[PDB]
Amino acid sequence: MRIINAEGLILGRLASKVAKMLLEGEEVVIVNAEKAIITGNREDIFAKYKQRTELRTRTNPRRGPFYPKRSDEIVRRTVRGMLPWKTDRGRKAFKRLKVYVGVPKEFEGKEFETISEAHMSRLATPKYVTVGEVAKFLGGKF
């Protein structure tokens, strides 16, 4: 499987590349999800994500949108948004993905791939926030 280290990567670009990989047919693992970044203003970003988490069906909450509070689930959900999710093809492609906070002992001892199109260095404006900080604001465990 292709193991990718997310330290210092732009989220949507990472997700686009990963989605195309999955559709072409590869198995992908992503480590260090809490260290990817989101560009823009702290308050706007936090407001957007809080609004997302406070969406719910008014007649039954056991149904309803379940938007994440954890960093790995946030990354996973971005990728899922980038796929055709209402088809067997996309369901399989999404099943072929795994995301992890940190580097678990299992993967300890390997060399990690990167992505050039996605890296903090193509940027010039310092306004940026971390997915771990988003998760802390929302109140999720790591």
Partner: protein, 344 residues
């Protein structure tokens, strides 16, 4: 427009039948004293006493009526030790160690016991667990306990539970557990007179009830009483949203719920059915016996107030996860009268 609060709470939903009659403890208190953080017994009945008030507030120093519940507590047996480690999300069990000689009745809960499992094997397993804990991987140690309902002739099938240990050192906890395993444990070694406690049990069952009693809904006007709708709610909601909302009160199961109470005071701990007030030794059992429960004969807790459950139900106790700031002293109060007249 008229305003008023909604009928009932949404904090105890869904209001369904409890998963088990044996209640589960979800959270534990932070205690510095290295001890077992709870006990279990069986509810017996209620009486009242006259005591001199201790707690802060008005009425302090005066003689007051106090209702009392009695809980029979025979000694527990410690049959195991568990180790916990930290996984990706939460805690996960690392391993278990059991005692080799268990009562014949334990097989009524645990149908599949080991065949030979001698003492030397038990000791080797203890040693393995000790060395595992002695490294730094382990994060928590808990005791495995079973009741002994046969001493008091109530039944023969025991209740099996897990209890946490106080402190903040796994090695201290393990030393305690290793000095406890394989033996009987009493309530006086665990609890201290005057404490505040939280009680846990499953409430009395009442079957299916309607919304008037399940939620506090009002009875309609007498015209509706003669129309056929007295004990009904008006409507299930508006045109849009074109569905029934989960917040609308409806009929269903009432009673037999898992519930927790806060800050009930432990008054006294008795032995062999007796209490010592002024040198005397008096019996708590009233003349004729407790209704629907016979004579108390082993050991008992005296708890202030009321507690969930029917009479012969299993009760669990833990110390005060959420106490107030002006606690009363941890000491048995001055009691002037205990009622032991007939209760039926």
């Amino acid at each position: 427009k008229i305003h008023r609060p909604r009928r009932g709470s949404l904090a105890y939903s869904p209001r369904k039948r409890a998963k088990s009659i044996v209640p589960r403890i979800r959270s534990w208190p932070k205690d510095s004293e290295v001890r077992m953080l709870g006990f279990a017994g069986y509810k017996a009945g209620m009486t009242h006493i006259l005591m001199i008030d201790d707690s802060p507030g008005l009425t302090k120093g005066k003689e007051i009526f106090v209702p009392v519940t009695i809980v029979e507590v025979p000694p527990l047996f410690v049959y195991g030790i568990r180790a916990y480690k930290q996984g990706y999300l939460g805690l996960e069990t690392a391993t278990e160690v059991w005692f080799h000689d268990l009562h014949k009745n334990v097989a009524r809960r645990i149908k599949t016991l080991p065949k030979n499992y001698n003492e030397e094997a038990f000791q080797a397993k203890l040693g393995q667990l000790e060395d595992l804990v002695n490294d730094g991987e382990i994060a928590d140690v808990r005791l495995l306990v079973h009741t002994q309902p046969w001493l008091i002739g109530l039944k023969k099938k025991p209740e099996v539970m897990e209890y946490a240990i106080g402190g903040d050192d796994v090695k201290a906890k393990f030393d305690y557990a290793k000095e406890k395993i394989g033996k009987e444990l009493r309530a006086g070694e665990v609890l201290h007179e005057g404490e505040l406690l939280d009680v846990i049990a499953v409430t009395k069952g009442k079957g299916t009830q309607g919304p008037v009693k399940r939620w506090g809904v009002k009875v309609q006007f007498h015209k509706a009483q003669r129309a056929g709708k007295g004990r009904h709610i008006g409507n299930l909601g508006p045109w849009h949203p074109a569905r029934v909302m989960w917040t609308v009160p409806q009929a269903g199961q009432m009673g037999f719920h898992h519930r927790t109470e806060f800050n009930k005071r432990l008054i006294a701990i008795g032995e062999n059915g007796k209490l010592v007030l002024d040198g005397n030794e008096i019996e708590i059992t009233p003349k004729g016996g407790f209704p629907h429960y016979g004579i108390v004969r082993s050991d008992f807790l005296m708890i202030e107030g009321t507690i969930p459950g029917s009479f012969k139900r299993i009760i669990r106790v833990r110390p005060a996860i959420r106490p107030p700031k002006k606690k009363p002293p941890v000491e048995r109060p001055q009691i002037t009268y205990v009622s032991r007249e007939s209760k039926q």
